[PDB]
Amino acid sequence: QPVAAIDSNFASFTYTPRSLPEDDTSMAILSMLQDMNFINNYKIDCPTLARFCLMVKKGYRDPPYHNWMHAFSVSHFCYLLYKNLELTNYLEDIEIFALFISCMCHDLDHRGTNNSFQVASKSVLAALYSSEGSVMERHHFAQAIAILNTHGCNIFDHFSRKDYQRMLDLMRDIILATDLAHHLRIFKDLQKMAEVGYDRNNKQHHRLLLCLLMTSCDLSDQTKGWKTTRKIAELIYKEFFSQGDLEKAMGNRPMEMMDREKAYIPELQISFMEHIAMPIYKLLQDLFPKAAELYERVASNREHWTKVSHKFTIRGLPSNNSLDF
Amino acid sequence: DDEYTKLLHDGIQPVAAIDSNFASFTYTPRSLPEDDTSMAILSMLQDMNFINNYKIDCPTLARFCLMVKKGYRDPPYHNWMHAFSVSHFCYLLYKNLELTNYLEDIEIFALFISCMCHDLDHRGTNNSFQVASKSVLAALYSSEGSVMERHHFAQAIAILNTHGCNIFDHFSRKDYQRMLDLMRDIILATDLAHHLRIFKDLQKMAEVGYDRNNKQHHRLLLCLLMTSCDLSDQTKGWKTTRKIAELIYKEFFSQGDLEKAMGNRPMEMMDREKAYIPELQISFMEHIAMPIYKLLQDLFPKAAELYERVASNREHWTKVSHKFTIRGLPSNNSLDFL
Ligand SMILES: [Mg+2]
Ligand SMILES: [Mg+2]
Ligand SMILES: [Zn+2]
Ligand SMILES: [Zn+2]
């Protein structure tokens, strides 16, 4: 089923994938994989790919932000980077395939809480993963492996030994890179690559670009219009404040951004965009000139947040004409 | 005409039957139902001995009280309950501050009557709006200033000149002229601009000491007391000051919306898109309210509690200001408000 039949704007950076109905996202996944040629290129079995994608979608829970629609929109951005940035000029085909597959699986079985929360609550996930770090990301990867090994879901089962091993190592590294702590950890290396210039002969640069691109996809809701950033802030903060409510109950001090009594959304949001999102799309711009508009949308969305911040102070009366609050 | 019939024929209820705390500074007259206010006016008049001392005709007094009440419209703040609450505070001053040591009986009577009448036919807009909107009131009075206040006074006289309502009609020519002059100065003194012009003279008066034998002192004291009555909602508890804030800004923001439709830029305190209520309230407490009650305390020591309540109410606004900034998400979990 052609990509062009979904919407004429599907491969544009202007397109908002969350506007696609959730019942159509699975075929949109197949259409993107076909449009990138990975089906014919790696001789993926069609019914297996079909069963795989349904398993991935079924593997997501329903918290406000970390759900299938997020995994879906992250994958679509990966497709957008393929179609708009000519990724084949920088990475091998298997690496692009791996990135896209990893985008689908990257938040599997997310519970709407961060890594710190898993450890503090002494969950099973923490017992299993806290000593290696990146608790939730190790779980996501493990859920992805458990899916691959379900009957009729292994899309790599015909791959050669070398290609099978490459896909698995790539998926692990890429899903692990989705811990923002990892991104911050490697930020200096990403800058160094961007300054010396990308070297496609350098396997180290391949890994680093894969990390940045993955991160760029995870944060891609910031690169659309105002409506998307506003809506996504609503979902993220609802999730944060729900975590903070659990922590307060445990007799723990939540961080400021998870404390609904104390959190000031405009400052948190502007800080997130100034100090995390923008420098990421700034690095992408340095490496890929065609990514310029991404960085420009983010900065523009940033200005919109500042221009709107004054609405968080109550001027005049509330609408009921009452001071009962 | 049954309201008049009952006011005249049922007899004046004893003031202590209204509430057990009726004569206390802590009492909040706005808790009295509006249907009970005319009789409470009669009760206060009786407890102060004015009806007997001035031989006020009962049918005339009843018609007068009802005509005054009906002379108020119903904007959110400047209505009959405001007038009633200002009168009641005048009464509190009488029962608590021993005013008969400072003022003649006729000045005290004039003060109370002036209180009932001081905001008559208020239309919910201020002096500046009368001039800018080219109102009939400004056509009559703008050249002299205190536009609304001149109108309130004029309305008071029109009620007195209504047949069967002149409660002063038997007074001598001298005493009649005296009452109407007192009402004029007192009602005109309810213009904040006037209060600000005489503030230094009030300060000097309280510094040198009140001289009962100084006519100018009597005049200054009357102005200060009238201003104290007009602002008296601030001397009650937090709930009163809060509710009163809501009424006043509802009235102010409505004016502001009109100025906007006329193509003028409204005062910040009138502008519902700019007004930040806690700052405006705190400023009013600091610059207007607190110094008035501090002067009252300087002249009458037993007024100390009034200043303390206003100072306390100013602290409460400071303590509550944080709630005007939205922390977390709004209650619907939506950023739809943008
Ligand atoms: Mg994640
Ligand atoms: Mg007035
Ligand atoms: Zn994610
Ligand atoms: Zn008044």
Swiss-Prot record, chain B:
Effect of Y249A: Decreased 3',5'-cyclic-AMP phosphodiesterase activity. Loss of 3',5'-cyclic-GMP phosphodiesterase activity
Tissue distribution of the protein: Widely expressed. Expressed in brain, with high expression observed in the corpus striatum. Also expressed in heart, placenta, lung, skeletal muscle, kidney and pancreas.
Annotated binding of Mg(2+), by residue: D119
Mutagenesis / variant outcome for changing Q234P: Loss of 3',5'-cyclic-AMP phosphodiesterase activity. Loss of 3',5'-cyclic-GMP phosphodiesterase activity
Known outcome of mutating Y249F: Loss of 3',5'-cyclic-AMP phosphodiesterase activity. Decreased 3',5'-cyclic-GMP phosphodiesterase activity
Disulphide-bonded residues: none
Phenotypic consequence of Q234I: No effect on 3',5'-cyclic-AMP phosphodiesterase activity. Decreased 3',5'-cyclic-GMP phosphodiesterase activity
Residue positions of the active site: H78
PDEase domain mapped to chain residues: 1-324
Chain residues that bind Zn(2+): H82, H118, D119, D230
UniProt superkingdom: Eukaryota
Family: Belongs to the cyclic nucleotide phosphodiesterase family. PDE2 subfamily.
Recorded disease: Intellectual developmental disorder with paroxysmal dyskinesia or seizures: An autosomal recessive disorder characterized by global developmental delay, impaired intellectual development, language delay, and early-onset paroxysmal hyperkinetic movement disorder that manifests as sudden falls or backward propulsion, eye or head deviation, and dystonic limb posturing followed by chorea and dyskinetic movements. Some patients may also develop epileptic seizures or only have seizures without a movement disorder.
Function summary: cGMP-activated cyclic nucleotide phosphodiesterase with a dual-specificity for the second messengers cAMP and cGMP, which are key regulators of many important physiological processes. Has a higher efficiency with cGMP compared to cAMP. Plays a role in cell growth and migration.
Domain comment quoted from the record: The GAF 1 domain functions as a dimerization domain. The GAF 2 domains binds cGMP, which acts as an allosteric activator.
SUBUNIT field: Homodimer.
Protein name from the UniProt record: cGMP-dependent 3',5'-cyclic phosphodiesterase
Organism: Homo sapiens
Gene responsible for this protein: PDE2A
Range covered out of full length: 579 to 916 of 941
